[PDB]
């Protein structure tokens, strides 16, 4: 009884005429997605530390299966319809070995923004943390880490590719959250991404809005097929 096993088939008809997945439509349909989906919201002045210099504003844990969904009334895109395709696709697999592409949009600022990547940092958070409320010794820009400095006067969307730097055979996706091992902190996430502002100058009254979109890469692979966890229909989100 392999996962695909037909003991005695009673097929009354011939098969349906073969299409290619791109004929009566013009694209090849297979399970690969570089479609970009959201990851976070907005920040205000009252969130940042008293000394906001070389201090990151966001601590983003890197998970192929996305972040732990949290419904708000300010953000209906999480509440009325669940998280995007990517985390539901990764829910049917166990391991990954590729890097992720990050597209980041910062709208309330016209001043320079930085983005740094910390591969070896243990991914023990399932939600992004902002400013003052960020753990100390975190959201401090490091020196010798992969980074990208961009001016918002030129372009206010940052596109970078986060590499796969894990000292292991695989990368674990769909990791539990609260209480450990040595496989949940160094082998699950690609690490953390720190987003900060070059200047220590105060945040505009209206505040700043950071929308992080991400996609899969080419050297990325969903290695082992697991059973699908029971899903929730978005169509029944009103009763």
């Amino acid at each position: 009884t392999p996962n695909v096993m037909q003991p005695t088939p009673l097929l009354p008809t011939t098969n349906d005429g073969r299409v290619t997945f791109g004929e009566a439509f013009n694209d090849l349909k297979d399970l690969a997605r570089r479609y970009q989906l959201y990851w976070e919201g907005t920040i205000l002045e009252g969130n940042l530390r008293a000394i906001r210099r070389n201090s990151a504003l966001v601590q983003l844990p890197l998970y192929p299966h996305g972040l732990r969904i949290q419904p708000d009334v300010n953000n209906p895109i999480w509440n009325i319809m669940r998280d995007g395709h990517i985390p539901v696709i990764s829910s049917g697999f166990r391991y990954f070995r590729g890097g992720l592409r990050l597209r980041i949009v910062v709208e309330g600022l016209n001043s320079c923004v930085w983005v740094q990547h910390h591969p070896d940092r243990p991914s023990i958070f399932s939600r992004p943390i902002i400013g003052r409320y960020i753990a100390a010794k975190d959201a401090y820009r490091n020196h010798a880490y992969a980074a990208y400095v961009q001016n918002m006067s030129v372009n206010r969307t940052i596109e970078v590719e986060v590499p796969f730097y894990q000292p292991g055979l695989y990368g674990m996706l769909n990791a539990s959250d609260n209480n450990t091992s040595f496989d949940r902190l160094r082998f699950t996430g690609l690490g953390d991404l720190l987003i900060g502002i070059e200047g220590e100058q105060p945040i505009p009254k209206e505040g700043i809005e950071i929308s992080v979109y991400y996609s899969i890469a080419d050297d990325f692979s969903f290695n082992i097929f697991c059973g699908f966890p029971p899903m929730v229909y978005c169509d029944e989100t009103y009763s």
Binding site: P122, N142, L169, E200
Partner: protein, 411 residues
């Protein structure tokens, strides 16, 4: 003939700069500050060798670790089975196994070996490690040691000689031999191993994959006409199979400047852009007869202080903890013998004067008398005393020399 070019525009994405991460196997466009605007590189000769920055070359160089004495007269420690020396096995060296130089209120300096310094520049690592043991003995001395490599262990809580023989080990003889090397393996559950020490990001140091232990097999024996002490000097180098994985935040720093600002409530060195500072006058402060720290000769340019933490006492004054400046400055006060003779003093103490959302600093000479005057001034401001009564604060005689850079303070 001015032909039209109706050739479709191309969608292009503007960006401020070229990659900040890329360091090799690519081109980096830049505005060369030269007269020749082509591919230009420094001229060389045999007087000026190629870059000597091969990782395998550097980390192959032997570094010295904390030595220890090996006495043969000790009737207790010099017995069969005793543990003479041990430590975790990893590229970086255990801080307690390194030559240290500590300083009061400063940073501890560690004499790290080539393999350790480089490894602190990379996140993960792997390969065999070469531990060379040098003995300060002569032909008369004689012994045998059993050095082992215990995988999966990081302490000597359950470590003994009769258990070390059950793992990768070597038995060295000390019979007219002063030097030997024990190249320890790389036995790991994984391919690469994370560095034990790293950039401040979490409150926990990672663990080494194994543990090396040196035991006694046949106790050291010397004679009457020979030194009973044989100092042992352990040295470390990386094996030919040693590799370093990913560049990360240095777990080390230079000892050029060991000055640091710990979580100790330093009083914030004004603000950035509001320094250098000098002692000057202010027309809104007692008709510019008293002294305050300015940062500009232009009016309305008083040095503002940064974010003072809310855990500081309101009645407290401050002290310079870094480089300071000299300044010339008060008559005797009623009821007390407090009087400051006209002369040049070194800035030491200070009292914060708040004026709305902006906070400034008032200078005080580094003298036993000045500390008490700033003591009272700090107390008078805490009780909201009349501005005219706190006036008898140092006087303004003339401007003073500017500071090299930011001046630090403390409660």
């Amino acid at each position: 003939d001015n032909p039209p070019d109706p050739t479709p525009a191309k969608f292009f994405v503007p960006i401020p700069s070229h990659s900040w991460a890329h360091g090799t196997n690519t081109s980096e466009p830049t505005n060369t500050l030269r007269l020749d605007g082509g591919v230009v590189g420094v001229g060389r000769s045999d007087d000026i060798g190629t870059s000597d920055t091969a990782i395998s070359g550097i980390i192959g160089v032997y570094g010295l670790l904390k030595p220890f004495d090996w006495n043969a007269n000790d009737t207790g420690r010099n017995v069969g089975g005793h543990l003479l020396w041990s430590m975790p096995v990893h590229p970086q060296v255990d801080k307690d196994q390194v030559i240290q130089v500590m300083t009061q209120s400063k940073l501890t300096q560690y004499y790290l070996p080539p393999i350790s310094v480089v490894s602190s520049l990379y996140a993960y690592t792997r390969g065999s490690i070469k531990y060379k043991f040098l003995f300060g003995n002569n032909p008369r001395h004689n012994a045998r040691l059993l050095v082992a490599y215990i995988p999966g262990i990081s302490s000597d809580n359950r470590l003994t000689l009769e258990r070390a023989r059950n793992s990768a080990h070597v038995v060295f003889s000390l019979n007219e031999v002063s030097e030997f090397v024990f190249t320890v393996p790389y036995i790991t559950d994984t391919m690469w191993w994370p560095r034990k020490y790293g950039g401040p990001q979490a409150a926990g140091e990672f663990v080494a994959p194994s543990y090396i232990c040196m035991f006694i097999l046949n106790p050291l024996v010397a004679m009457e006409s020979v030194p009973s002490i044989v100092t042992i000097v352990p040295m470390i180098a990386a094996g030919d199979d040693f590799e370093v994985a990913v560049p990360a935040q240095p777990a080390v720093g230079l000892s050029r400047n060991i000055d640091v600002i710990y979580p100790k409530d330093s009083i914030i060195s004004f603000k950035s852009g509001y320094f250098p500072v000098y002692v000057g006058s202010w027309h809104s402060f007692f008709d510019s007869t008293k002294a305050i720290l300015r940062y500009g000769a232009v009016s309305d340019h008083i040095a503002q202080l940064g974010n003072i933490p809310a855990n500081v006492n309101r009645k407290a004054f401050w002290i310079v903890v870094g480089d300071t400046i000299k300044f010339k400055t008060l008559d005797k006060i009623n009821g007390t013998e407090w009087f400051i003779p006209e002369g040049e003093y070194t800035l030491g103490y200070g009292v914060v004067w708040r004026d709305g959302a902006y906070a400034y600093m008032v200078p005080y000479p580094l003298t036993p008398l000045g500390e008490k005057i700033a003591q009272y001034t700090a107390s008078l401001l805490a009780s909201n005393t009349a501005i005219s009564q706190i006036r008898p604060i140092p006087d303004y005689i003339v401007d003073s020399a500017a500071s090299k850079d930011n001046i630090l303070w403390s409660p």
